[PDB]
Amino acid sequence: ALYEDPPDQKTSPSGKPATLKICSWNVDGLRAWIKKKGLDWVKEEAPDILCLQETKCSENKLPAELQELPGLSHQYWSAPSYSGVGLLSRQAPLKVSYGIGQEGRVIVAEFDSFVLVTAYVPNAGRGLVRLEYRQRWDEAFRKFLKGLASRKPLVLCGDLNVAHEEIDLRNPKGNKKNAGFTPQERQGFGELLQAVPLADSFRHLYPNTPYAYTFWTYMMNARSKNVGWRLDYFLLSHSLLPALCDSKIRSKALGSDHCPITLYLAL
DNA sequence: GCTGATGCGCCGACGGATCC
DNA sequence: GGATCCGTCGACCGCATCAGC
Numbered sequence: 001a002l003y004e005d006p007p008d009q010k011t012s013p014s015g016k017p018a019t020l021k022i023c024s025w026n027v028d029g030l031r032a033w034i035k036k037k038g039l040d041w042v043k044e045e046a047p048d049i050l051c052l053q054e055t056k057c058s059e060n061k062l063p064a065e066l067q068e069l070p071g072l073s074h075q076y077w078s079a080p081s082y083s084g085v086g087l088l089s090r091q092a093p094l095k096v097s098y099g100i101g102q103e104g105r106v107i108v109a110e111f112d113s114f115v116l117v118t119a120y121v122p123n124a125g126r127g128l129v130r131l132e133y134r135q136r137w138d139e140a141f142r143k144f145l146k147g148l149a150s151r152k153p154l155v156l157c158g159d160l161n162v163a164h165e166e167i168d169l170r171n172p173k174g175n176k177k178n179a180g181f182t183p184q185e186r187q188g189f190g191e192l193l194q195a196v197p198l199a200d201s202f203r204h205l206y207p208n209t210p211y212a213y214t215f216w217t218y219m220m221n222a223r224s225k226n227v228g229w230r231l232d233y234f235l236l237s238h239s240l241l242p243a244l245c246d247s248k249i250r251s252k253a254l255g256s257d258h259c260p261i262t263l264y265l266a267l
Numbered sequence: 268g269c270t271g272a273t274g275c276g277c278c279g280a281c282g283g284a285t286c287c
Numbered sequence: 288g289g290a291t292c293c294g295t296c297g298a299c300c301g302c303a304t305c306a307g308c
Contacts, residue, residue, distance in 0.1 A: 028277090029301045054277095056302060082276075082302075123277070171279070173292075178278060218299035220279055227279070257277085257300075 002226050003211040009246035010264055018245040018264040023047035024118065024157040024232060026215075026258035030055040030086070034063050038255040045250070045262065046071065048090045051107075053120035053159045054256075055084035080104035085120045085158070100144040108148075113267050114240065115152050117145065121161040124179035131184060134161075138188035142195045153237035155265075156198060159258065160233050164189045164200065167210050168230040180229055198235040201247035201263060212249050215258045223257075234263040243267055 010018040023045055027033035030052060042050060050072055059077045066075065072088040081102035087109055095110040109116045119141070124131040145154065162185040166172035175181040192198060206212065213228030222228060234247050245264035253260050 032301055054301090126277075174280095174294095175278070177294095180278095217278060220298080222279070222299095225279095 001211050003213070003249075003251060005212070005249050005251055006206075008248065008264065012243060012245050012266040014242060016243075016266040018266050020049075020263075020265040020267050021045075021047045022049045022051070022116070022155065022157065022234070022263040022265070023260050024051040024053075024159075024234070024263075025253075025260040026053040026120070026159040026232060026256055028054050028056075028256035028258065030057045030084075031061070031063060033255045034065055036255040038253075039065050039069075041250075041253045041255065041260070042069075042072075045253075045260065047262065049109075049116065050086075050088040051116075051118035051157055052086035052088075053084075053118070054258075055079065055086050056082060057084060076107055076109070078102075078104045078107055083120060085118055087116075087118055100141055101147075106141075110150060110152070113152065114237075115148060115150050115154050117154065117156045118158045119156065120159050123161050124182060124185060126179065128177070128179060128182065131179075131182060135184050135188060138185075138192070142188075142192055145192070145196050153240045154196065154198065154235075155237075155240065155263070156196075156235040157233065157261075157263065159231055160189065160235075161231055162186060162189045163229045163231060164203075167208075168213075170211070170213065170227040170229070180231060193235070196235075197238060199238060199241060201234040201236050201244055202230075202249070202261075204236075204241065204244070205247055213251075214249055214261055218257050232258060232261050234261065240265065 074089045074092045076087045078098045084104045087107045093109040097108045100106050105120045107118045124134045163169040163181050213230050214232040216223035216228040243266045248262040250260040
């Protein structure tokens, strides 16, 4: 069944208006993504912070368009020394660091009232050849997140490469041995929520909404049929839940095999 | 400099078996 | 014997290097 995201809810349930818009997007190659008009969509979406995964592009090779972004001028990039992530912000963060204590997968940015983590979580791979590394990575990531020195609440966003529950992908049955839906990956996601702790922003708001996905394989015209997976998330500290206005899946923005996702927070 | 082949990371379709 | 379950197989893209002109 096709899906259409509900309209933007820009006011918190108590009634306070959204003041921060965060967008996260696995762009499947930043240079290709830009040529496919990805930046045009970002300008229309006008977020305060933009998080990119799978940039596939070192900093010296960033297209010039990216320094034509006056509303997203504080830019931070991290590539492995493939992969690669980026963080663009209207305002300067107080602190930026890379890694989880050069894989080019995690950027941590401290702002006034929260800490933003963007992550491109390692894929378990075809035939699950990298699953044990992913499980070991998951545990190190959890420890890093909880061990964060600040008492500020956390926003974790990006491509976490796991469909948490069956409702999060079109074909749960045929995929329980595929990357992104092993019991090992699903369990790691549950542990992240419990350990840190964190809430799945989109699911806290739409706990029973099926067919909402953020990735479709390029093969077999899967996106036309909305045969997809929900791999990209905004995960929120419990104390940020009153500030949560909405969590969006921008199904119609093309340019990658992932679509953008957008968080509205009332801070 | 530029192209194209190649390699690498990144599952839905389909055919067959089992179940009531 | 339709529904379900299970294992098999071909394949979209972007980016790298390499070979040749």
